[PDB]
Amino acid sequence: IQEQTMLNVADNSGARRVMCIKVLGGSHRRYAGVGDIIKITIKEAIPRGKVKKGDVLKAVVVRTKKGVRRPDGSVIRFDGNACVLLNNNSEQPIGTRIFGPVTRELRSEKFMKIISLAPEV
Amino acid sequence: MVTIRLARHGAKKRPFYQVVVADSRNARNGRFIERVGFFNPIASEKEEGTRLDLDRIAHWVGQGATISDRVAALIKEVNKAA
Amino acid sequence: NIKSAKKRAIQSEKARKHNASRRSMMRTFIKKVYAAIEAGDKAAAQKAFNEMQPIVDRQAAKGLIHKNKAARHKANLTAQINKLA
Amino acid sequence: KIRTLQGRVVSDKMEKSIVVAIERFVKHPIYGKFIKRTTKLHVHDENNECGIGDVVEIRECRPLSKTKSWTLVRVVEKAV
RNA sequence: CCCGCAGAAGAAGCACCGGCUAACUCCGUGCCAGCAGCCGCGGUAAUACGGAGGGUGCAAGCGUUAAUCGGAAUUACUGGGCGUAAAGCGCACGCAGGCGGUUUGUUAAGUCAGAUGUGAAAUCCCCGGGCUCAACCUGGGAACUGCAUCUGAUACUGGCAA
RNA sequence: AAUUGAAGAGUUUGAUCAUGGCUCAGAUUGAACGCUGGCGGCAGGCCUAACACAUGCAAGUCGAACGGUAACAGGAAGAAGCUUGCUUCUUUGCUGACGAGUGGCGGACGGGUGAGUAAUGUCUGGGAAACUGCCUGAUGGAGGGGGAUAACUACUGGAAACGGUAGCUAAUACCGCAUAACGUCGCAAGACCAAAGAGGGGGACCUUCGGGCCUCUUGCCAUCGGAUGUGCCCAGAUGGGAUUAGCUAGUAGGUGGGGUAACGGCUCACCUAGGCGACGAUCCCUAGCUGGUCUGAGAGGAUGACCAGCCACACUGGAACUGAGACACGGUCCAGACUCCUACGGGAGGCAGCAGUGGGGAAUAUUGCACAAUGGGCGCAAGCCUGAUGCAGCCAUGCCGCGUG
């Protein structure tokens, strides 16, 4: 979300906690927490994951405690912030399976694979 | 059930069957309780083409052992009216 | 369907429902005898024992109690209703 | 009539039970020297009769506890 | 499996040759190329390298490698050593443990003898039988050197007593 | 008849004799590689990745339990070529048989693998506290009712395992009543617990005209036996490391209560503070174990390929259900560290079965035929199934025989 935000990971290849190092898109863009792309580092990883500690790559925010507002005024709030890990250059998901609920605003461009692998949309 | 049956123990194309008492669940050449006798299908001049311990077959039949079709045929061949 | 493993799954489910019903009823009657023992009065304990005993014998006959459980339940609760005095 | 093992008692600190060491004189399989070996058995005691250092005769029975399978000394009714 | 047909007709390689280890000369190379399990060979007459000829083993296989055992008595129970080759604690007192002078009685735990149960079958060994033979299959025995139980002996050991 | 059995040599040194290591000559293999290669017989053939698996098969059976007819056959009131069966109806279960269904038995055997497991395991020897389908012996019962459901019918859930909603029906499905003992509980008196039919043929009688009736076969139930399989206990044996010395509170016993088919800390409450260990407890590494196999003159050393017994596992970690037997290879329910699959919402799968594919490797085979035999499952039987098994294919992989005169 913001810079210096600890985030959980939905995908299996992404391993445990990640922390946002830069909020991509825009000059002084402060808060981007719905389907935006954020640069992360890996602050703690399990050895089963392909990525390791201290690796910088991109992500997309999938679940947020702030919550997205629907057009009718509905607010869908998830407990705990989550992201899905992406490559720096290709911006495609490293993780083979997506865990947890996803929101229907993650439908544009490369995130159809995320919502297809995800259980609940 | 306890069965008195044949167990193939010979070489290739020359079988030698051991007439044996065993549990029905066990393998053909596997665990057995006692060995009654034998039967070689390959014909020869000897009178030991088939040998059976008819006392043991009678003891196990009284105990409840069932007799296979080949063993009943060999018992019909090895009797008083041979 | 034609495979016997599927028909065994159907039969195992139906038999589990039936056996759970009967096992529940006999454990209700046995816990009635134990509750009357904990109350400390002998007449309702003997009436509960006389009501439990044909049920536990019958289900030993049908084949889920295997008759030594019935013997142990009767023996233990006969000892307890006699020690109530 | 019954298999009996005879040995001295090591502890009576157990309640209604004792531990008995049976000493067996076995040949070594390779070196041939008759070496003495000890088997320690937990033995059930009735009325805590066996006190430490006493040679008692023990008899195999049903499992009375975990690690306990042996029983009392001798014939009952105090034969003299 | 038997009979018939044609034609020697369709059917021989691998390793080694200095010693251990059966089998040796010549040509080329000249501490080079290279061999080697060990000793070791090669620096211009190489039975040791590489070819040929000859010979020796084994043969539908032969060498090389890996692994085990033997030789290795080179872990020694059978069956080794410790002055100097490896090895006597620097020395002593000592618990556990190991081992104990002599006589008699008793027990039979070790020991011995006999018997019984078991130690599956197969394998291994012996006497036979069947595949034309062998491999292979198979009858019976022997063995399974073991354990338990019963009876008997009391010389040695152990227990008890004197 | 059945231990008829033991070889050394090269190398330290100028040379010797010792000591001592190294090396060789022998046999062996689940062997590989190089060179070469004719046949047959018998045996053997993933030793690594218990890595991942495309595809086909490896577990079905009984119409002699039952309702029934989805197919295949035999019977036709209806009129026909104006030929009378050379073909057909609202048709029917009426019969043989039989898709699907209920039910029974088997799916716990057989086949695979050696991951775990250094001792809930194996081998040897003893014991009591137990169960045991199918097979067998003895004795006695087998009387009479009820309610439901699948299949089916109609509706219907985006087309998940495919489920729901009403109504109808049968049984050897299910549940009561009687019966009640050589069974269970109890010191006794006493109390209590069982079931089910089907098939084949028939003098007389009565009758739906199917039967009552008489046999025969099989099936049911109870109890006590046998046999077999299994559960449990004890003793001994069962790698290495003491550069692993102290481990253990359900731990050690007792008494009560529960639990199991059964003894038991198996489990709980309370009491006692015990228990194991220098004859190696505990910890770490490694490993299935045996009969056996290789070597050896033996004693030993090594090893557990094939074959046979026992154990353990079935993508990983749990768990129970059914059942005589499982905590279940080709059964269920969860979590996933994996692949396929939308109606993207809604799920399927598990070759360490037989072939075979990828990978790993120095290396290890056919996506073959047959149930003819021997075994197993079901059935009364015919028979059906059987990647057990019998065979064949490939490979000089081993042993053996013959040939190339």
CA of B39 to C1' of E26 (A): 71
Gap from B29 CA to F305 C1', in Å?
A: 20
CB D7 within 8 A of CB D21: yes
Tell me how far CA of residue A78 lies from CA of A34, A63, A119, D52, in angstroms.
12, 6, 15, 72
Neighbours of chain D (3+ CB pairs under 8 A): none
Residue B22's DSSP bridge partners are: B3
The kind and range of the H/E element at A90 are: none
- Residue B10's Cβ-side half-sphere holds a number of Cα atoms within 13 Å equal to 14
The reply to whether the CB atom of residue C7 sits less than 7 A from any atom in nucleic acid chain F is yes
Residues A77, A82, A83, A84: what is their CA dihedral angle, to the nearest 10 degrees?
A: -100
Q: Where are the domains of chain B?
A: 1-81
- Report how far residue B27's alpha carbon sits from residue D62's, in angstroms, rounded to the nearest whole number: 36
Task: Provide the sign of the torsion angle of the four alpha carbons B67, B71, B77, B80, taken in this order.
Answer: negative
Count CA atoms within 13 Å of residue D1 on its CB side: 2
**Residue B60: which nucleotide is closest by CA–C1'?**
F227
**For chain C, how many structural domains are there in total?**
1
Largest CA distance in chain B: 36
Considering all nucleic acid strands, name the nucleotide whose C1' atom is nearest to the C-alpha of residue D30: E77
Place of tokens 């640069």: A39
Q: How many residues does chain A have?
A: 121
Q: Is A112 helix (H, G, I), strand (E, B) or coil?
A: helix
- Tokens at residue D74, please? 């001798």
Concatenated DSSP letters for B12-81?
TTB--EEEEEEETTS-TTS--SEEEEEE--S--SSSTTEE--HHHHHHHHHHT-EE-HHHHHHHHHSSS-
- The first and second tokens of residue B34, run together, are 């006692």
The structure tokens listed for D67 are: 């690690």
> What was the resolution (in A) of this experimentally determined structure?
3.2
Q: Report the CATH number that the domain containing residue C84 is assigned in CATH.
A: 1.20.58.110
DSSP state of B82: -
- What gap in Å lies between CA C60 and CA C69, rounded to an integer? 8
Encode A80-116: b = buried (16+ Cβ within 10 Å), e = exposed. ebbbbbbeeeeeebbbeebbbebbeebeeeebeebbe
Please give the residue range of the domain that contains residue C78: 1-85
Gap between the Cα atoms of B6 and B29, Å rounded:
9
State the Cα–Cα distance between residues A61 and A57, nearest whole angstrom: 13
Query: Strand order in B17-23's β-sheet?
Result: B50-51, B34-39, B17-23, B2-8, B66-67
Q: Treating both helix axes as pointing N-terminal to C-terminal, what angle do C42-62 and C68-84 enclose, rounded to 10 degrees?
A: 170
Alpha-carbon distance A74 to A70, whole Å? 5
Q: How far is CA A12 from the centre of its chain?
A: 13
Whether residue D59 contacts residue D2, with contact meaning beta carbons closer than 8 Å, is answered with: yes
Measured in angstroms, what separates residue B71's CA from nucleotide F30's C1'? 38
- Cα distance between residue D46 and residue D41, in whole Å: 16
- Report d(CA D73, CA D46) in Å as an integer: 9
Burial class (CB in 10 A: 0-12, 13-18, 19+), C41: exposed
* Nucleic strand F under 7 Å from the C-beta of A12: yes
For the range B38-45, what are the long-range contacts, defined as Cβ-Cβ under 8 Å and sequence gap of 24 or more?
B39/B6, B39/B70, B39/B74, B40/B10, B40/B15, B40/B16, B41/B15, B41/B17, B42/B14, B42/B15
Torsion, Cα D22 D26 D29 D34, to 10 degrees, reads 130
Q: Let me know: does A77 contact A66? Beta carbons within 8 Å.
A: yes
Q: Please name the residues in contact with A100: beta carbons below 8 A apart, sequence gap of 6 or more.
A: A10, A62, A63, A82, A118, A119, A120
Smallest Cα–Cα separation from A32: which of A48, A15, A19, A20?
A: A20
Find the nucleotide nearest B42 (Cα to C1′): E130
Rounded Cα gap, residues B17 and A34, in angstroms: 79
CA distance B63 to B68: 16
Q: Is B8 exposed, middle or buried (0-12, 13-18, 19+ CB in 10 A)?
A: exposed
Output phi, psi for C36, to 5 deg: -70, -25
Cβ proximity of A91 and A58 under 8 Å:
yes
Spatial distance from the CA of B71 to the C1' of F387 (Å): 28
DSSP letters along C36-57, please?
HHHHT-HHHHHHHHHHHHHHHH
**Which residues in window 15-74 of C are less than 7 A from strand F by Cβ?**
15-16, 18-20, 22, 30, 50, 53-54, 57-64, 66-74
Residues with CB under 7 A from strand E: B 9-11, 14, 16, 18, 31, 35, 38, 42, 44, 46, 48, 51; D 3, 25, 27, 30-36
